[PDB]
């Protein structure tokens, strides 16, 4: 059929006014959802999804220890000494399941969880320990805390797995450069990816521990050198005062890497520029440890 | 035997579970807001909302566990008119988080049971006069049961009502923790007998 045009202005306006009688926030909110799909499809595919993952992850380390003190202190009425010999929480949550009672202790061997030094130690802890027997009613949620902490560790592995993969998704070169947990904490103190990408190199240094920075700014003191970049996988790989200057060098190359990741529309998503940076950072480190401040006599 | 240590351990765990699971439910709810934020007002039940987050992994019709019957249809007709974004591996790890919300709420539920059971074992006069919640938290409130008995009726505090009933109910619950402290085998009948003296005064209230 033919199509008529050049005069549909008033007719389109009039049936648009009739659709307002068809009505008003509900139809226009279905139109809002229309715009929500058609625009979110349009300009991308974020900064916000990764920033509560790090808050959850930092809550997980605290939550493991503050359930782990409960895990020992509920088990010191059966084994006071088993708190002191093995100190890691996942071995304790495994060793409620693995040791069992003191009669099941000497029978059950420990090739999986702390062997060959601590097997003798738990066999010497089983024979003398000043705690009591604990009943089968008691081994219902003592017995279940031991697998709850195990599942908390497994969920922490899912947290680290998702953080590590999505770091390669969002920031492919910086998380090829400095490490991914700093790769979370830097955006965490930043906020947006742009909020760090608009932050200069000297703010990639002192992003976290900025008190002594401010004690250096207003009191006449001296700033930290390392900052939140201390715990990254490359600053501690030096020694001594050499760990100071490298705190610039990564924070330099981070600005070269983050803005390669936060500001490139065509992108390999493959970590090269970050590795091109990290090769030179390692080369500055290898030239830096080459020097020695001693006297080298002939 | 007759121990009071496990009750304090169970309560000291339960408070952190009650600070853990609802927190992780708000975390999962913040995550699912980038897939379906609309269901969380229709389904605020944070265990069963983390069952329905666990249930329909992608969008939406023909539902079974959405009702087990108005919230099922109210979620299906809302999930048809979708508002948020959409990916998959993020959604999978987030569903694993909602699974941990489910398992941790289940562990809190199993903690509740053995808590009330060790209550009913060791302190039945504390669980009959009041109930296992206030009674099991009471032996944390003194730190231990032997520090409940040496406390007075005035020195202990619980929750015209506050001046009278929080003193006289404290009297009988202290006297309940007495016969729970020094008996070898405590009874459930005289907990209700000392409950009934609060019952006459409370019918007078």
């Amino acid at each position: 059929x033919x199509x008529x045009x050049x005069x549909x202005x008033x007719x389109x306006x009039x049936x648009x006014x009739x659709x307002x009688x068809x009505x008003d926030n509900d139809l226009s909110k279905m139109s809002l959802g229309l715009a929500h799909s058609i625009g979110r499809h349009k300009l991308k595919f974020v900064d916000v999804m990764i920033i509560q993952a790090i808050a959850l992850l930092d809550d997980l380390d605290k939550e493991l220890n503050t359930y782990a003190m409960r895990c020992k202190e509920w088990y010191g009425w059966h084994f006071p000494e088993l708190a002191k010999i093995v100190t890691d929480s996942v071995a304790y949550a495994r060793i409620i399941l693995t040791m069992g009672i003191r009669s099941k202790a000497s029978e059950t061997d420990l090739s999986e969880i702390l062997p060959e030094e601590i097997e003798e130690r738990v066999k010497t802890a089983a024979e003398v320990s000043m705690g009591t027997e604990i009943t089968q009613t008691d081994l219902d949620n003592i017995n279940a805390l031991a697998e709850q902490i195990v599942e908390f560790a497994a969920y922490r592995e899912q947290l680290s797995n998702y953080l590590s993969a999505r770091m390669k998704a969002i920031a492919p070169n910086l998380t090829q450069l400095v490490g991914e947990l700093v790769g979370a904490r830097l955006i965490a103190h930043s906020g947006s990816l742009i909020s760090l990408a608009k932050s200069p190199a000297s703010t990639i240094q002192i992003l976290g521990a900025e008190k002594a920075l401010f004690r250096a700014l207003k009191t006449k003191h001296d700033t930290p050198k390392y900052g939140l970049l201390y715990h990254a996988s490359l600053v501690g790989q030096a020694t001594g005062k050499n760990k100071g200057k490298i705190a610039r060098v990564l924070a330099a190359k981070a600005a070269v890497s983050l803005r390669y990741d936060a500001l490139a529309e065509d992108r390999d998503d493959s970590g090269d520029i970050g590795l091109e940076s990290r090769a030179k950072v390692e080369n500055r480190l290898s030239q830096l440890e080459g020097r020695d401040l001693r006297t080298t006599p002939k | 035997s007759k121990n009071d240590n496990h009750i304090i351990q169970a309560i000291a765990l339960l408070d952190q579970l009650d600070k853990d699971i609802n927190t992780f439910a708000m975390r999962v709810k913040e995550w699912y807001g980038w897939h379906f934020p609309e269901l969380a007002k229709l389904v605020p039940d944070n265990y069963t909302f983390a069952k329905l987050v666990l249930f329909i992994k992608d969008k939406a019709x023909x539902x079974x566990x959405x009702x087990x019957x108005x919230x099922x249809x109210x979620x299906x007709x809302x999930x048809x008119x979708x508002x948020x974004x959409x990916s998959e591996t993020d959604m999978e790890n987030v569903c694993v988080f909602a699974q941990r919300v489910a398992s941790l709420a289940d562990y809190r539920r199993q903690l509740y049971d053995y808590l009330c059971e060790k209550m009913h074992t060791v302190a039945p006069n504390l669980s009959e006069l009041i109930g296992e919640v206030i009674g099991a938290r009471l032996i944390s409130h003194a730190g231990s049961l032997t520090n409940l008995s040496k406390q007075a009726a005035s020195t202990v505090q619980i929750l015209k009502n506050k001046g009278r009933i929080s003193r006289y109910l404290a009297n009988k619950c202290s006297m309940a923790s007495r016969i729970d402290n020094y008996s070898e085998e405590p009874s459930n009948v005289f907990g209700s007998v000392l409950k009934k003296q609060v019952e006459q005064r409370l019918e007078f209230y």
């Binding site: 008033x10 648009x16 009739x18 139109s31 809002l32 229309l34 715009a35 058609i38 349009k42 300009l43 | -």
Partner: protein, 228 residues
Amino acid sequence: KVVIEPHRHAGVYIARGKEDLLVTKNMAPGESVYGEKRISVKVEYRVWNPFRSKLAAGIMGGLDELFIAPGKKVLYLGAASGTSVSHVSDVVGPEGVVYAVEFSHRPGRELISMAKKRPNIIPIIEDARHPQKYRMLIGMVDCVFADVAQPDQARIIALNSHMFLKDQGGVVISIKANCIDSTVDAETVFAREVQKLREERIKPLEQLTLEPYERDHCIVVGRYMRSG
């Protein structure tokens, strides 16, 4: 302590304190469109930016009848990052809505996520040159506001004037001087645009100059007659 004052229109407000401020009630607790501040006086209130939103600039400049009213539904064009559409929704409240239009692709996700949290904002990413590309979504608006960067802002606002204007409804157009002439003085361009805007059934009521908020902006208040 803090004095909270009704501005010359309903919906808008004014903080008198240590410093004077133009302020506006917040629809949702605790979220920002662009990182802006807030104040509890308890009732929530948010400072507007006349330097960033030309609507707030005509609001602080002294203008008689801005047609954005708490009862009414208002159209917007040129929503650069949505700097105004939360302000229009918070000045109309829930009974009124803002139907926003923005065609540039880079900053529109903040408008989308702003309509995600405050229900009065509705978005448009369809094209405004041919306005019947978003014919399906809005119908028969009361008053319009314009912030696009095309030279035919008179004609593109005419192409929305022949569609969405309520007959005997008002219209405010925020005109920048740079898109059209950019060398000759702004008033000889504003009389030219008034001559062109009377050609499409808007008879102007007021002309207003943003002197300390913009360099040579304007807003034209008129009332569109006899069509819609």
